[PDB]
Amino acid sequence: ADNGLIIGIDLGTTNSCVSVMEGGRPVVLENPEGKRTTPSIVSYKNNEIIVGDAAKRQMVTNPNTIVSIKRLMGTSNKVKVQNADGTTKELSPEQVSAQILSYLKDFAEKKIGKKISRAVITVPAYFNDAERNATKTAGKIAGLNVERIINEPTAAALAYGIDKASREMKVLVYDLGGGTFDVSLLDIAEGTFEVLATAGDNRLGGDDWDNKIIEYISAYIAKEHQGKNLSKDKMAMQRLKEAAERAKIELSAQLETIISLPFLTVTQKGPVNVELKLTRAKFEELTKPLLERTRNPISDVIKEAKIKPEEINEILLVGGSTRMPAVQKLVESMVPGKKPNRSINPDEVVAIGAAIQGGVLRGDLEHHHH
């Protein structure tokens, strides 16, 4: 019976984001640790479910941490967590996904100062009915009336206002997430979106670029400390993953970065301190195979849609890793003449679009001009 706000949620494989319309503009809401996105990670302890940044950090000590649950959505697969009494609890992807949604909902309410019971949740364009219905159910479990499930590339196009275009547009969306890569071709006409073709690689994402930096640091460690290998040291590995992420981010702004890992372990010889330079050129060399794998899905969607690349009017970049300068160059190489758009934060653009759709569903005509 609610006529209230409809939040927009990007429930990603790797990270999630929540946005809402406020005074005729979409606003991205920060979680309680001040972050505009939240890891799509849930961990389990006795009488306690931990979501987001904290669950990620506690991975070192908690083997009952569930990552990438989106990959199982729409399946009858279960995940297992081990209770302290030695018994096993089976969880559905819906139940785990609901914990993520519940967390987003809870902090959004505290931000907005209002109870929230309505959402738009985004999904990949290739999701079938089972996968869509699983997402709806996760929403229902979290106490959300899921007003609409919309496609992630469609949400991105909504954020850029492409539905308002004066002519029919074909739009390419290049979506490089944390663990998956997706390409979509949309046709937008008379205000409605049609997915013409999709392609991708579900085992290619930003994490893979990070992993090359982890490998690079690990090679250096072995070379400088007589073959020393920390692959089994979970806290060391967590710090290397964190260091790799930071390095990658800095190399999107600068031509070099310093990886700094004081006191990474202690051997019989003494503390191990890593201080290591990585150039953008070397980072690009190490990861060129990953980047080149993004080329083939673009050619595939163009082929499938039966268009010439000149028929693509507009390109959207989605996913934080699209900030890498080498990604921009690749995409430009494949769609000559066109600017890869990332002026809306690619980490946030899908949730923003979902929030816009929420305002539309609510018939909210409040504008910043009023």
Candidates 298, 352, 301, 304; CA nearest to 327 is: 298
Please give the order of strands across the beta sheet that includes 48-51: 48-51, 41-45, 65-67
Asked if 187 and 158 count as a contact pair (C-beta separation under 8 A), the reply is: no
- Token duo for residue 122: 């985004």
- Cβ–Cβ < 8 Å for 248, 210: yes
CA distance 220 to 293: 27
From the list 94, 131, 147, 175, the catalytic residue is 175
- Let me know if 175 is a catalytic residue: yes
Pairing mode of beta strands 145-151, 118-123: parallel
- 248 CB neighbour count, 10 Å cutoff: 22
Do 318 and 17 contact (CB within 8 A), yes or no?
A: no
**For the chain, first and last CA: distance in Å?**
28
Q: CA 267, CA 58: separation in Å to the nearest integer? A: 24
User: How far apart, in whole angstroms, are the C-alpha atoms of residue 82 and residue 62?
Assistant: 10
Q: Minimal CA–CA distance to 152: which of 171, 124, 130?
A: 124
Which tokens is 43 given? 């961990």
**Residue whose entry in the numeric block shows the structure tokens 């690990």:** 218
- Assess contact for 46 and 83: CB atoms under 8 A: yes
- The answer to whether the beta carbons of residues 138 and 164 sit under 8 Å apart is no
One-letter-per-residue 3-state SS of the chain: CCCCCCEEEEECCCEEEEEEEECCEEEECCCCCCCCCEECEEEEECCEEEECHHHHHHHHCCCCEEECHHHHCCCCCCEEEECCCCCEEEECHHHHHHHHHHHHHHHHHHHHCCCCCEEEEEECCCCCHHHHHHHHHHHHHCCCEEEEEEEHHHHHHHHCCHHHCCCCEEEEEEEECCCCEEEEEEEEECCEEEEEEEEEECCCCHHHHHHHHHHHHHHHHHHHCCCCCCCCCHHHHHHHHHHHHHHHHHHCCCCEEEEEEEEEEEECCEEEEEEEEEEHHHHHHHHHHHHHCCHHHHHHHHHHHCCCHHHCCEEEEECHHHHCHHHHHHHHHHCCCCCEECCCCCCCHHHHHHHHHHHHHCCCCCCCCC
Q: Smallest Cα–Cα separation from 285: which of 326, 234, 244? A: 326
Sole residue written with tokens 């096993």: 88
C-alpha dihedral, 178 to 56 to 347 to 77, nearest 10°: 60
Please report, to the nearest 10 degrees, the dihedral formed by the alpha carbons of residues 76, 79, 85, 86 taken in order: 90
Q: Judge contact between 157 and 188, C-beta under 8 A.
A: yes
CA atoms within 13 A on the CB side of 304: 17
Q: How many CA atoms lie within 13 A of 194 on its CB side?
A: 9
The catalytic residue among 131, 147, 152, 210 is: 152
Q: How far is residue 350's CA from residue 155's CA, in Å, rounded to a whole number?
A: 5
With left for phi above 0 and alpha for psi between -120 and 50, is residue 257 left, alpha or beta?
Answer: beta
**Looking at the chain, how many residues does it have?**
370
Query: Catalytic pick from 10, 147, 207, 208?
Result: 10
CA distance 341 to 316: 5
70 counts as catalytic:
yes
How many Cα atoms within 13 Å fall on the side-chain side of residue 24? 6
- The backbone region for 84, taken as left when phi is positive above 0, alpha when psi lies in -120 to 50, beta otherwise, is alpha
Domains of the chain (ranges; CATH) run 1-165+345-370 (3.30.420.40), 166-344 (no CATH)
CA distance 234 to 256: 27
Experimental method: X-ray
Compute the Cα dihedral for 209, 290, 317, 280 and give only its sign.
Answer: positive
Residue 306 near residue 155 (C-beta atoms within 8 A): no
Q: How far apart are the C-alpha atoms of 56 and 58, rounded to whole Å?
A: 6
CA distance 133 to 191: 25
What is the b/e burial string over 283-309, where b = at least 16 CB atoms within 10 angstroms of the residue's CB?
bbebbeebbeebeebbeebbeebebee
